[PDB]
Scaffold this motif. Structure first.
Motif, PDB file in Angstrom:
ATOM      1  N   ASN A 169       1.043  -1.599  -0.438  1.00 44.04           N
ATOM      2  CA  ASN A 169      -0.146   0.104   0.074  1.00 44.04           C
ATOM      3  C   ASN A 169       0.818   0.719   0.262  1.00 44.04           C
ATOM      4  OD1 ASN A 169      -2.824  -1.517   2.243  1.00 44.04           O
ATOM      5  ND2 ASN A 169      -2.229  -1.382  -0.327  1.00 44.04           N
ATOM      6  N   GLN A 216      10.721  18.265  -2.023  1.00 44.82           N
ATOM      7  CA  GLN A 216      11.215  17.931  -0.502  1.00 44.82           C
ATOM      8  C   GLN A 216      12.497  18.171  -0.351  1.00 44.82           C
ATOM      9  OE1 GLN A 216       8.315  16.664  -1.590  1.00 44.82           O
ATOM     10  NE2 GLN A 216       6.780  17.060  -1.056  1.00 44.82           N
ATOM     11  N   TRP A 253      10.205   7.734   9.695  1.00 45.72           N
ATOM     12  CA  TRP A 253      10.885   8.853   9.627  1.00 45.72           C
ATOM     13  C   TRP A 253       9.027  10.460   9.836  1.00 45.72           C
ATOM     14  CZ3 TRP A 253       7.593  12.449   6.253  1.00 45.72           C
ATOM     15  CH2 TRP A 253       8.747  14.072   6.124  1.00 45.72           C
ATOM     16  N   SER A 298      -3.528  -0.590   6.708  1.00 46.15           N
ATOM     17  CA  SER A 298      -2.193  -0.245   6.586  1.00 46.15           C
ATOM     18  C   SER A 298      -1.894   0.596   5.323  1.00 46.15           C
ATOM     19  CB  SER A 298      -1.261  -1.960   6.036  1.00 46.15           C
ATOM     20  OG  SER A 298      -2.294  -2.633   4.536  1.00 46.15           O
ATOM     21  N   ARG A 299      -3.808   0.298   4.164  1.00 45.89           N
ATOM     22  CA  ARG A 299      -3.447   1.519   3.718  1.00 45.89           C
ATOM     23  C   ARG A 299      -3.745   2.409   4.253  1.00 45.89           C
ATOM     24  NH1 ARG A 299      -3.830   1.013  -1.813  1.00 45.89           N
ATOM     25  NH2 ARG A 299      -4.527   2.550  -3.058  1.00 45.89           N
ATOM     26  N   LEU A 331      -2.924   3.419   7.287  1.00 48.53           N
ATOM     27  CA  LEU A 331      -1.613   3.768   7.977  1.00 48.53           C
ATOM     28  C   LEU A 331      -0.101   4.618   6.726  1.00 48.53           C
ATOM     29  CD1 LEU A 331      -0.016   3.710  10.128  1.00 48.53           C
ATOM     30  CD2 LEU A 331       1.282   2.104   9.275  1.00 48.53           C
ATOM     31  N   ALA A 332      -0.151   4.046   5.477  1.00 48.96           N
ATOM     32  CA  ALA A 332       0.703   4.047   4.209  1.00 48.96           C
ATOM     33  C   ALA A 332       0.091   5.750   3.948  1.00 48.96           C
ATOM     34  CB  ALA A 332       0.485   3.159   3.064  1.00 48.96           C
ATOM     35  N   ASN A 364       1.670   8.391   6.281  1.00 48.30           N
ATOM     36  CA  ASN A 364       2.370   8.823   6.673  1.00 48.30           C
ATOM     37  C   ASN A 364       3.210   9.081   5.214  1.00 48.30           C
ATOM     38  OD1 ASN A 364       2.770   6.906   8.831  1.00 48.30           O
ATOM     39  ND2 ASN A 364       3.446   5.225   7.437  1.00 48.30           N
ATOM     40  N   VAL A 365       2.495   8.522   3.582  1.00 47.65           N
ATOM     41  CA  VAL A 365       2.969   9.986   2.676  1.00 47.65           C
ATOM     42  C   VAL A 365       2.193  10.954   2.081  1.00 47.65           C
ATOM     43  CG1 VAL A 365       1.239   9.136   0.153  1.00 47.65           C
ATOM     44  CG2 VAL A 365       2.953   7.783   0.910  1.00 47.65           C
ATOM     45  N   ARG A 394       2.705  12.896   5.235  1.00 51.84           N
ATOM     46  CA  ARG A 394       3.525  13.461   5.967  1.00 51.84           C
ATOM     47  C   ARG A 394       4.320  13.763   5.445  1.00 51.84           C
ATOM     48  NH1 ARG A 394       4.308  16.817   8.919  1.00 51.84           N
ATOM     49  NH2 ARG A 394       5.241  16.433  11.605  1.00 51.84           N
ATOM     50  N   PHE A 395       5.038  12.811   4.077  1.00 47.60           N
ATOM     51  CA  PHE A 395       6.319  13.714   3.205  1.00 47.60           C
ATOM     52  C   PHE A 395       6.140  14.364   2.571  1.00 47.60           C
ATOM     53  CE2 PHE A 395       8.814  12.404  -0.309  1.00 47.60           C
ATOM     54  CZ  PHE A 395      10.447  12.268   0.378  1.00 47.60           C
ATOM     55  N   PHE A 396       4.847  13.969   1.255  1.00 48.48           N
ATOM     56  CA  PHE A 396       4.210  14.783   0.938  1.00 48.48           C
ATOM     57  C   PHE A 396       2.901  16.611   0.743  1.00 48.48           C
ATOM     58  CE2 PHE A 396       5.502  11.615  -2.448  1.00 48.48           C
ATOM     59  CZ  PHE A 396       6.560  11.885  -3.501  1.00 48.48           C
ATOM     60  N   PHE A 424      -0.037  15.965   1.263  1.00 44.33           N
ATOM     61  CA  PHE A 424      -1.483  14.962   0.201  1.00 44.33           C
ATOM     62  C   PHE A 424      -1.263  13.891   0.164  1.00 44.33           C
ATOM     63  CE2 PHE A 424      -0.331  15.543  -3.984  1.00 44.33           C
ATOM     64  CZ  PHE A 424       0.318  16.885  -4.043  1.00 44.33           C
ATOM     65  N   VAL A 425      -1.155  12.882  -0.504  1.00 44.99           N
ATOM     66  CA  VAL A 425      -2.294  11.615  -0.692  1.00 44.99           C
ATOM     67  C   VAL A 425      -2.670  11.815  -2.095  1.00 44.99           C
ATOM     68  CG1 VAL A 425      -2.461   9.433  -0.841  1.00 44.99           C
ATOM     69  CG2 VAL A 425      -1.660  10.660   1.412  1.00 44.99           C
ATOM     70  N   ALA A 426      -2.638  10.948  -3.510  1.00 46.49           N
ATOM     71  CA  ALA A 426      -3.575  10.783  -4.272  1.00 46.49           C
ATOM     72  C   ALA A 426      -3.984   9.522  -3.596  1.00 46.49           C
ATOM     73  CB  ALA A 426      -2.570  10.549  -6.188  1.00 46.49           C
ATOM     74  N   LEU A 427      -5.535   9.871  -3.824  1.00 49.29           N
ATOM     75  CA  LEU A 427      -6.474   8.806  -3.185  1.00 49.29           C
ATOM     76  C   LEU A 427      -7.365   8.441  -4.249  1.00 49.29           C
ATOM     77  CD1 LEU A 427      -6.210   9.804   0.280  1.00 49.29           C
ATOM     78  CD2 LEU A 427      -6.061   7.554   0.003  1.00 49.29           C
TER      79      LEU A 427
END
Lengths: 294, 294, 294, 294, 294, 294
Positions: free
Chosen positions: E214, E261, E290, F227-228, F230-231, F234-235, F237-239, F241-244
């Motif tokens: 995922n 980033q 992270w 898990s999706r 949670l992913a 985290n994603v 938190r990185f970028f 946003f999330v492309a959902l």
């Protein structure tokens, strides 16, 4: 279903197959069968070619309505109102649109060649033959010459028969090509002399042709409709009502008749027309001249 | 259903099969049959090739409307209003668009080769033949030469016949390729001299071509519509009403006529046009010049 | 139905079958028939290869509009406004996009090999032959050499004929591969020297190509529309109305004309363009330069 | 209909059949025909293999836009702005994506084996042959060796010919397998040294690749749209309006131009890019560096 | 149409037929052709089997992203941050998922048997042969042994050849079955020792696998989207606007970027991961570690 | 399209035909080829039968998750928490569901008979043969016996070979039928002793099986979803946003995570389960026992 299938086709493979079957049956009944006999086969060639030519020529005269316009002019105009030159121009137009189809038939039959080998086998000079040793009894010359197109020569004369077949098929196809050539240049010079000797221009003549097509189509349609409403009036006078369709009830609603039009008025709009002009403005038919005359 | 099937095709496998059957029947009636005889087969080659060439050339002159524009110019302009040089340029354009199709026919017939072996079998010098022992009676030289394209040589002369067939088919295809070559460079130089010797540019000439196409299409459409409304006026004057369709009733609603246009006005918009300019602005047809002239 | 079937295909199995039938008929009329004769077959190879090459080269010059841009520059610019180096660069671009197709034709014909065995059968040295005992009359050497590509050798010389066929087909395919090789490296070096010797970048040159495509497409569309509305104005001045479609009535609604554009303005937007810049900002065509010039 | 059928396929059985027919015709014109002759067949093998290799290599250099990025860097950067090591890394990437296809062609041709039996038939030592009694004239050794791949050995030497065919086809397929092996390990070590010697990570390099794809696609799209609106502005300045579609009218509505972008700005966004970082944040293209530079 | 036909299949009979045709063409170019010669055929068996094995092994190393995770760990971690035992476990996982395909290729090739009869025909002891009278010249022993797999034995030795073919095909299929047996028990013991020597459970390892799938899928999707919005920002800075689709305009609406980033952050989320736990709660990737680290 | 075609089938005639083609190719590579040689063919029968048996047995152990439940029990329970009798019952269940497929393979291979005639041709006592005169050299007895299953007997011994083939095929099919018989009665007695020696009833055991199926399915689904999300955390938190997708955006809407679950909790719900009861109410899994334990 004739207009329906001719306008919107059911399956064209089966349609072309049924057309091939009907063409097989009808072209079998009109297939060229040469009488391999002297003084007899040119008569058959002349009949089996010039008679479908004369039939198609007659049919082209019949279906052309300018024939009946000219016959109505000489019928009720009855005093040479249109002179010998408009009669000659109208007759030339009629005979041309008639002679489209016999010329095409005679050209196809000349390029086929079969009528000409059949018609001129007996006239071939026997001394002019080559490619073999000359074997011709002068008593039975014309008969064994005339028996050539059925492939009924002796096998001693098969080379002679192939020579006469190729020579007369040459003269047939040469006559056919020179015929379609002179017909093409005749068509070209008739169009050129028509455009050169017309008083009005060619764009106005195209407008006149569009007017005549629109006027004949609109006149046939409203003559059918006017006759239907007159028939409904007479029928209603008989029974008390008319069994009309929905479209026919719409026709009785829209277009009423008190009466039809007199016979001199029908005579006035009929006949051949030769482009008059009323006060500088052009008139394009006898119906147009009659409508402006009121 | 001609325009319907030509615009929206019913099944193209069966359509191509029926086209192959009609092509079989029509190409059978025009198939080249060589008269294997001297002084007779070049006449047949000349007829069966140059006569469809002359027919297609005549047809290309007929269907080109610039022919009738030029004939109308010399007809009613009648005083060399367009001089010998605009007449020459217009005639060059007409003869070119005409001679597209006879050149293509004669090129296909030369690359076929059959008319040329047939037409020149008799002119082949018998001493120039190779690949066998020379077997030619000088009395019967030209006849047995001319009988070659039917494959009617003796089997002692089959090598000779193959040599003459290959040599004359070479000269045929060489004439055909040099013909299509000089026609291509002729097309190239006519386009280059047209673009070099036009007074206006090539983008304006493309706009002029688009104008002429739009004006002829719009003029034919509104001439049909104007003639239909005039025909409906005359027909209504006869019967009291017109049987119109829904679209035709819309046409009578939108576009009324009081009368048609006079013959000198139709003459004014007809003829050949040579790019005038009224007060610096360009005029692109005689109709455009006439409309600006009001 | 040409654009309709080419954009949305009816059944592609039957379409490929009808294309195979038409390819059979057209490739039969252009099939290579070697004249197995000396001094005669290299002339046929040169004609039947270099003439479709010259035809495709001429066609590529004709359909390229940069040809007419350059001819318009030398026509009305008429004073070497673009010098010998922009003329040379434009001519190089034109001749390259032209010579795409003759090079491809000559490469396919060289890899076919048939024109080269036919053209050089007679030049093969008879002493250089192997794989059999040397059987060549020195009088009839060149003729029996030239008769090889028709498979018309004697059966005593079939091994000799296979040797010459393989050797000359080798030299044909070797010439074809070295031709497509030097054409590929020529294409590579022309692209590299174009990108190296262009003043502007390659991304800007891609934008310029997109501009030129958009400007030619938009200009053809609005030239057709502007000519249609001008034609409708003239036609309405003639008849009193125009028979327009619904889309055409929308065009007359949206876009009116008072008049068309003068001939010097059409001359100003036509010609070859060499990337000027007005006040640091780039101009990408003569139409763009003209529009900024106002 | 190319993009339409390539994106949404019409019937794939007929499509694969037409592809098999076109593959038959095109693979017939490029089929390997061995010249069974010494000193002549290795030249043909080298041509017919290394020339499609060189063509596909040239094509791979042409279609790679990094070629033109590097040529633009050395063109307008013009002072070794990117040094010999970034030039070497970029050249390695270009030559690799180019040499995908010639390596695949030469591997397929080596596994086919036909070019290698043809190219090395003459170099086979005649004393090294087995499976028969040694029958080789030392004068005609190399020629009868070189005539083996056409199956043109004598029937006394058919076992010898099968032995040489199997041995040289072995050496061909062995060379092909060792070639695809060293190409695979070369691909592996280039990927490993790229990932080991890149300054940025592999996830960031995947993001960079996604950025470059998105930026080139978005740039081509908006360059087409921007050029279309600029073309519409110039066209409207010419005629007074533009014939736009509905989508194009939406484009003129949404995105206006006052003017295009200067040539130094187009130069600034073009060239090779070597991953700078502005104030710790990464820049992924010259367009990104230019946009952050404002 | 690759993803479209692979996700939604057009007609699978024609698809399987075109796959059979492509399999015929590709399996023809890779078909095993044994060099029936000593010291030469085991080299060909080793090449034609172990080289597709090495190619598939290399491909399995390349496409596994754990390869690049480990190479990034040793690249930028650069101090043995993960020790020799996590490196060994990661390398074991990589080499296993790589060696799936070469083991399957070598097993299929051993069960085919052809490479092994070809590779070991020459090593068969001639005295150990039965079912006929012993007919082997000791000088030509190894060569006539090695010529067996092409069925090129003498007919006096066809029983001998069938005996060696059956014996070596036995040893081939026995080696193939013992190979797939030890590979199966190897797969079983690797799974058992992985489950026994993992610190976390197997349900948590299944959750970890679902998380990694995922997270890689969501990360690739939002990296594509984030790169697209960054590309649109740079493109808009260039031209003034972006030609976006409707979906792309939705992407610019939803997800804005100020900037991308930094490179140490991209380095922080990249590398091999060895299941840390932050304050008792588990972390399942470097991105998860992270994100919790903030 | 694997799950799509497996759930909703495209045309099953073509599907069964492509399955027959793949079965032809795969059953050709695993077809039984008997080494007609003594001491060699029973080894091949043992390999080619017992190795697919051992492979299917290993696969049945691998895919059974009770294997990993038991290995997790002995791994982290690590003190014989479940004793030797629950370990024996679990191992019996695992080995049974594993040994479904090797027993079916060995039964099909015994009823085929081919492995057994091949494996025991050499052990047939030559004096026990009938239906002919005894023709066996005692030196070459075992070899000509072992060569029987390839139909490689002499024609003097074809009756002997048919007798041994029928006798050993009898012993094969007899072993296969007695094997499937004892496997059927073994299956019957295992089911009877399971139902007799279970503490809970059979309706409750059916409810327990339905619970375990529902709990494993619901746990895999919500583990994928958890898990999706949670992913996605985290994603994001990185970028930023999330492309959902739309469904994924619904998942982030419905189910939030603050954090995942600790490793001892994952250990608590994993392992083998032996039907405890908490305060008289039954617990059906370790997850159920853990959820009631809170």
């Amino acid at each position: 279903s004739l207009f329906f299938k001719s306008k919107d086709v059911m399956i064209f493979n089966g349609l072309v197959a049924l057309g091939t079957v009907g063409s097989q049956e009808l072209f079998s009944v009109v297939a060229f069968h040469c009488p391999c006999s002297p003084a007899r086969n040119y008569l058959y060639g002349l009949a089996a070619i010039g008679v479908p030519a004369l039939v198609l020529f007659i049919i082209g005269i019949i279906l052309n309505n300018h024939t009946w316009n000219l016959v109505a002019e000489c019928q009720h105009r009855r005093t040479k109102n249109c002179s010998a030159a408009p009669t000659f121009l109208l007759l030339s137009s009629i005979l041309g649109r008639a002679a489209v189809a016999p010329v095409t038939w005679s050209v196809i039959s000349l390029l086929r060649g079969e009528a000409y080998v059949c018609a001129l086998s007996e006239f071939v000079d026997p001394s002019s033959l080559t490619a073999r040793e000359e074997h011709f009894p002068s008593a039975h010359a014309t008969e064994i010459l005339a028996r050539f197109p059925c492939k009924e020569n002796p096998d001693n004369l098969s080379d002679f028969r192939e020579e006469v077949s190729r020579r007369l098929r040459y003269e047939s196809q040469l006559f056919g090509w020179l015929l379609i050539g002179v017909v093409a240049i005749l068509v070209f010079l008739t169009k050129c002399l028509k455009h050169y000797c017309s008083p009005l221009s060619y764009r106005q003549e195209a407008y006149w042709a569009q007017y005549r097509a629109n006027e004949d189509q609109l006149f046939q349609r409203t003559a059918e409709v006017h006759s239907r409403v007159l028939a409904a009036n007479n029928v209603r006078r008989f029974f008390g009502f008319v069994a009309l369709n929905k479209d026919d009830e719409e026709l009785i609603a829209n277009f009423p008749v008190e009466g039809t039009q007199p016979r001199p008025q029908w005579n006035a709009i009929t006949g051949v027309y030769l482009y008059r002009e009323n006060q500088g403005l052009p008139l394009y038919s006898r119906l147009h001249k009659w409508a402006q005359g009121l």
